[PDB]
Write a protein that binds this ligand. Structure first.
Ligand code: MG
Length: 192
């Protein structure tokens, strides 16, 4: 059984959002969701954080897909990935929000920018390590490539968020429309 929390960058740079909800749909529909099966919560972050829904809010896959399709982009000029990730760790993965005792914890972090808080990342990721939270991280290079931005540090930061081995837990996605192409591999790895 798996408790999976998706930590979704909602910043304005990500476009179109339909591509993100398509990714969520395609990923989640492959799961058997339920109190004795897989649970999913989703946290959206930008400049702040929102719990879109709790791990124990929904008891079927069909419910989660309907909820997923309805997540709206909250925007943000900046990217508080350390805040989003840390909020997933200490709020989303609590029994109060449906986390199940003794069940494995998996975080899937999806982002298209370097965080403002880079600084607190080392510590947040260390607490995740301490708490055995397996992390998959997905860097979307679309907005950066579209602004002729250097993606080197960006990719390094997101790689650094993923669990080792990096080549299993980190995904470099060129652009938003390409997000749906990783779903099979992402799913296979999460449920290895
Ligand atoms: Mg962004």
């Amino acid at each position: 059984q798996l408790d999976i929390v998706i930590v979704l960058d909602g910043s304005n740079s990500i476009y179109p959002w339909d591509s993100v909800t398509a990714f969520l749909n395609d990923l989640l529909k492959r799961m058997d969701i339920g109190p004795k099966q897989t649970q999913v919560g989703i946290v959206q972050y930008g400049e702040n954080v929102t719990h879109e829904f709790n791990l124990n809010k929904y008891s079927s896959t069909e419910e989660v897909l309907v909820a997923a399709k309805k997540i709206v982009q909250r925007g943000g000029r900046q990217t508080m990935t350390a805040l989003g990730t840390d909020t997933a760790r200490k709020e989303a993965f609590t029994e109060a929000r449906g986390a199940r005792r003794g069940v494995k914890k998996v975080m899937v972090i999806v982002t298209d920018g370097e965080s403002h808080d880079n600084h607190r990342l080392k510590k947040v990721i260390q607490d995740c390590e301490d708490e055995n939270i397996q992390r998959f991280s997905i860097a979307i290079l679309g907005s950066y490539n579209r602004g002729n931005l250097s993606t080197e540090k960006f990719v390094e930061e997101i790689k650094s968020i993923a669990s080792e081995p990096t080549e299993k837990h980190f995904f470099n996605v060129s652009d938003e429309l390409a997000l749906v192409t990783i779903v099979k591999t992402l799913g296979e790895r999460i449920f290895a």
